[PDB]
């Protein structure tokens, strides 16, 4: 409903099988990416190209 630390937490459920954990399109200048450092800087330019580095850390 509002911005919060939880917005960064991706929930993972025990004993679930082959089910989807999360999804997103790759418009780096909008959506989930819009507020990130990458998204923020990317928006200062019209064109982009190259490879993205997406990582996940288990807690």
């Amino acid at each position: 409903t509002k911005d919060e630390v939880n917005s960064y937490l991706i929930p993972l459920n025990a004993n679930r099988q082959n089910e989807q954990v999360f999804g997103t399109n790759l418009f780096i200048g909008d959506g989930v990416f819009k507020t990130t450092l990458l998204g923020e800087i990317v928006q200062y330019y019209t064109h982009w190209s190259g490879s993205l580095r997406f990582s996940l850390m288990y807690t």
């Binding site: 200048g29 928006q43 200062y44 019209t46 064109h47």
Partner: protein, 274 residues
């Protein structure tokens, strides 16, 4: 220097240069010296004026728009009142330059723009105001102006030009295509969708040019008309095609009007008439 025609005399051989077979798809380089007796003559010509660099290398008007200086009090939609205006950048709105560009399929070049602004005071006015125009380039993704006085006109990152009305603005822009060349035609869509748009209108999302008058309003109303000119430089062209024959109907698509006059002239007489 170069010879235009070599000296050629009588002929009687089994080498018949003027007998070909156009179904091969080739246009054999037959010369006058292949079918008549010729004398020597020189070119004294390089064909510099027909170089694509020259052909697309001169300024052509690509857009005309209008904005006006008047009291903004009460106006809800500034854009509509023309307190400021837009131009969705494109080069196929005015047909003259368009037909030239469409003589090719792919085209690559840098662009040199020249923007002319002319004032007009149709109603009663005591003097001609000295207005300053601001043309700001709004690349796709940049916030669009909503009021002639948005924060958007700060233009911290968007490039923009300020110049007096009556004067002219000039600057060049590098080749901004996302691909190696611009497409004059595109037999495709934005994605595999049943209803989505067809044509280069899909590739041509170059953004807008926002125009406004920096001055506050005067007692009278001033109408400023803006004309944008485009000159190509450092030109490259690929895949020449058949010239446009029928009139255009829309920006970007090849559509032509229903019920159009024939394009080919009809003989006033026979097929034998001179």
């Amino acid at each position: 220097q170069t010879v235009a025609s070599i000296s050629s005399g009588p002929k009687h051989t089994q080498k018949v240069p003027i007998l070909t077979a156009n179904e091969t798809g080739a246009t054999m380089p037959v010369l006058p010296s292949d079918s008549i007796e010729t004398r020597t003559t020189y070119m004294h010509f390089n064909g510099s004026e027909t170089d694509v660099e020259c052909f697309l290398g001169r300024a052509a008007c690509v857009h005309v728009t209008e904005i006006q200086n008047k009291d903004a009090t009460g106006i809800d939609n500034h854009r509509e009142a023309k307190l400021f205006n837009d131009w969705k950048i494109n080069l196929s709105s005015l047909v003259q330059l368009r037909k030239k560009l469409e003589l090719f399929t792919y085209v690559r070049f840098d662009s040199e723009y020249t923007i002319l602004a002319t004032a007009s005071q149709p109603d009663s006015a005591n003097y001609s105001s000295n207005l300053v125009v601001q043309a700001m380039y709004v690349p796709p993704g940049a916030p669009n102006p909503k009021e002639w006085d948005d924060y958007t006109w700060q233009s911290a990152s968007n490039p923009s030009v300020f110049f007096k009305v009556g004067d002219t603005s000039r600057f060049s822009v590098p080749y901004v295509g996302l691909a190696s060349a611009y497409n004059c035609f595109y037999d495709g869509y934005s994605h595999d969708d049943a209803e989505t748009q067809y044509g280069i209108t899909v590739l041509n999302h170059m953004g807008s040019m926002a125009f406004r008058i920096v001055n506050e309003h005067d007692e009278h109303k001033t109408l400023v008309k803006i004309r944008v000119y485009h000159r190509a430089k450092h030109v490259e062209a690929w895949i020449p095609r058949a010239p446009r024959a029928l009139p255009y109907t829309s920006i970007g698509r090849t559509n032509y009007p229903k019920n159009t006059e024939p394009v080919i002239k009809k003989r006033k007489g026979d097929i034998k008439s001179y």
